[PDB]
Design a protein around this ligand. Sequence first.
Ligand code: HEM
Ligand SMILES: FC(F)(F)c1ccc(N(c2cccnc2)C2CCN(c3ccc(C(F)(F)F)cn3)CC2)cc1
Length: 445
Amino acid sequence: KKTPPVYPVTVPFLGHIVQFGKNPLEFMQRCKRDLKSGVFTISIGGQRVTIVGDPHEHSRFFSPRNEILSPREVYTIMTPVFGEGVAYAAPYPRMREQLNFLAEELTIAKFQNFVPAIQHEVRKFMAENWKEDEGVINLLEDCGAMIINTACQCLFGEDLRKRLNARHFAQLLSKMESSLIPAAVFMPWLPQSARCREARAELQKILGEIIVAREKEEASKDNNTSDLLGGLLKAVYRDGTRMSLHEVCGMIVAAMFAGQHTSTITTSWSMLHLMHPKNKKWLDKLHKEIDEFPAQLNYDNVMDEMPFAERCVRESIRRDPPLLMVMRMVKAEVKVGSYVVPKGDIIACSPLLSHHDEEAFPNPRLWDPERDEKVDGAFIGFGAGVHKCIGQKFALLQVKTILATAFREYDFQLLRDEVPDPDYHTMVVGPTLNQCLVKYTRKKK
Ligand code: HEM
Ligand SMILES: FC(F)(F)c1ccc(N(c2cccnc2)C2CCN(c3ccc(C(F)(F)F)cn3)CC2)cc1
């Protein structure tokens, strides 16, 4: 009944925040290698951080209930972004209720409209920015613009898009997230909240006026508005109450924030690999898959006739996962294989680490869409168990739709010799900005 072997500190109360900041992959790999164990504890400012680095031991982290493993006290940082009483700020039972309303808005039933709506905004963006036949663009900043555009074309109603467009909304999103610093998640003890508040107090009033307007159309039942907002208004809790504007806006914000960073990074990655000359066989097999498709794609095409595309996307999330660390706070310990994690200990599971386990993924730095996890449950890019990703189906659909639409009508050339190196400065990891310069070439008669 002993604890994981603690990696020693040299500079004290720095813990490892410097060695970790530069390159998390190498650091964690070295820790795993030296300690001869996938399971080990590191110190971050004195805090006992315990990583579960053995892909065979994943279900230990993802299976327990919240009362045993609590995300809240480690994920608090998001409380100003979504507001109070929303998500973690709210108690677990009612957060579950909140998440149920959101998940019931991303049902495969809603997805029938999404495919044509995503294609519309991709082709709009390509008509206004891909204007020349040959041009240089930054892929990372462009896929983001496409992700926010198409996501608003899916879950935002006509009237809401007239009173808010995506391009202004993304400026509200960045206005809101800038209060996040990676080194504020382990210390329980704001110069940006002042700008964070004014963004929500702006969005909340805009939404409130759309609601005031929709209740004055509601008389006809002819308004027929069934978007993310439309369903969240109708939401009724277990105890008869309904969502207030504060809880409503927070939910919309969360819906967009979650998808926009993770999806755009995924898309960008996916495009850089296929674009690369070493990956030509994969680009061809992609083409073999999408060449037969009509100009206007339907739900079946993307979902049913596009497995290989999904193999590329998933591989991209397997190789370079957007979220490096998933975290919990232990309230009551349960055995982790042979070791045991004590109460008060901060337990983590790292998609960045696990996705690079030689047994699970031989040659982890190789992009290979046809490869299958050699250990069941190794791939945890969307998480697993109690807190698996509810946006997984939508993001997959979103990225695939974009890839199919882009490659069908364009060719791409990477100004670089090698695929961009990930940037670990940010908490959510994507490829380097100044490395993401790409040349586009339009396909002609
Ligand atoms: C590539 C795209 C995405 C990735 C990589 C991703 C990744 C993840 C991961 C790793 C988790 C687990 C969090 C944890 O256990 O600590 C998660 C949970 C979640 N994701 Fe995503 N996600 C993606 C897209 C989306 C989208 C589009 C949405 C919503 C639109 C979304 C909403 C959520 C939500 C609500 C959770 C709930 C976590 C919980 O149950 O407490 N995600 N996602
Ligand atoms: F809808 C929702 F319920 F409010 C919600 C939305 C997004 C998320 N997350 C999320 C983000 C991007 C894609 N998919 C899901 C996060 C919320 C907190 N989270 C993390 C993950 C890591 C870190 C840290 F410490 F590394 F910076 C901080 N927060 C992981 C899931 C969780 C809940």
